[PDB]
């Protein structure tokens with residue numbers, strides 16, 4: 478559980494670093510700095526307007542953006558369930 | 568677990584083949600080609616703007632679209648839950 | 660499990676009957692007939708735009724609408740988890 | 750289980766008392782009185798338009814609003830999961 482939450486924070490920070498560099502210049506409101514990118518990736522993790530509000534607008538400039546976002550959603554949500562269920566048992 | 572992930576991929580692919588055919592011509596931005604259709608059905612599976620942003624606009628042209636999307640949501644949502652729980656149990 | 664799904668269908672139909680009578684006249688696009696109301700209550704059960712898209716617009720005309728919608732969400736989602744987990748075990 | 754449902758109600762009430770105070774004057778439609786604040790925090794807890802529709806507009810005026818809402822989502826989401834699983838286990 479402790480190791481699970483550690484992995485989640487590292488992946489979240491690494492993903493927000495990547496997102497800042499990729500979309501920061503073209504999408505400054507969402508990815509303009511590390512802070513903004515961490516906030517956006519949390520919104521995306523919660524699945525709130527991820528496609529209609531974030532990813533589809535991002536894909537209009539960067540067609541391959543889904544290669545970042547879809548694996549991120551698959552990875553962070555699977556980890557979150559694993560962490561939530563893992564903490565409940567212990 | 569592997570068979571579940573295989574079944575989900577097959578079901579997902581056929582669903583996007585069907586959706587391209589049904590809505591492609593009338594909704595090209597969301598279902599105009601297999602790629603776009605795989606992306607939309609993923610958005611639909613996550614439940615993101617599925618009704619307000621996709622299914623209701625689709626229902627304006629195709630009144631029965633709900634016969635496709637509602638069973639799709641029910642089928643994939645039950646499977647993704649079963650798959651994610653399946654990995655957790657088969658690791659404890 | 661079989662009894663759980665039976666209860667869910669009855670509550671869903673009864674709720675869609677109630678919604679048609681309550682909001683049908685003022686909100687015809689969402690609750691104008693039993694069919695429309697069943698579709699809307701499914702959208703509301705999945706939590707998609709339930710407040711921003713449906714309930715807040717409904718509350719502008721019917722201030723107490725939340726007394727219908729909030730218990731519905733609480734009831735149908737709890738039942739759905741109970742049914743999903745219940746089927747997985749058996 | 751009962752203690753969990755009690756803790757959630759207390760946490761929910763205090764959160765809506767705080768939100769009324771912090772955002773009431775600047776966001777009256779969503780946090781203008783305790784009632785509106787209880788309703789908004791329920792919408793936020795379900796994750797419905799929490800960021801695009803509530804938290805980002807709130808962050809335009811109050812840049813630190815995320816310090817309130819993100820821990821709120823994390824706290825209530827973990828509790829609601831724990832409460833719902835808790836009833837299921839304490840019936841099997």
Ligand SMILES: CCCCCCCCCC(=O)N(CCO)C[C@@H](O)[C@@H](O)[C@@H](O)[C@@H](O)CO
Nearest residue numbers: 489506512513515516519808809812813815
């Ligand atoms: C899982 C761990 C999730 C951690 C989430 C961390 C969020 C950090 C957000 C932050 O530090 N901000 C700067 C606060 O000064 C908020 C930004 O999101 C903000 O600059 C922009 O979004 C603006 O557009 C808002 O008007």
Ligand SMILES: CCCCCCCCCC(=O)N(CCO)C[C@@H](O)[C@@H](O)[C@@H](O)[C@@H](O)CO
Nearest residue numbers: 626627630631633671688694695697698701
């Ligand atoms: C858990 C069980 C969920 C069951 C869901 C049943 C849905 C039945 C929907 C239906 O029969 N319709 C009529 C099909 O002719 C669709 C309506 O939703 C439609 O009339 C309106 O929404 C219009 O506004 C669309 O343009």
Ligand SMILES: [Br-]
Nearest residue numbers: 523822823826
């Ligand atoms: Br969360």
Ligand SMILES: [Br-]
Nearest residue numbers: 550551554613
């Ligand atoms: Br998912």
Ligand SMILES: [Br-]
Nearest residue numbers: 640641644705
């Ligand atoms: Br569902």
Ligand SMILES: [Br-]
Nearest residue numbers: 732733736795
């Ligand atoms: Br809920």
Ligand code: NA
Nearest residue numbers: 526616708798
């Ligand atoms: Na949503």
Ligand code: NA
Nearest residue numbers: 524614706796
């Ligand atoms: Na959701």
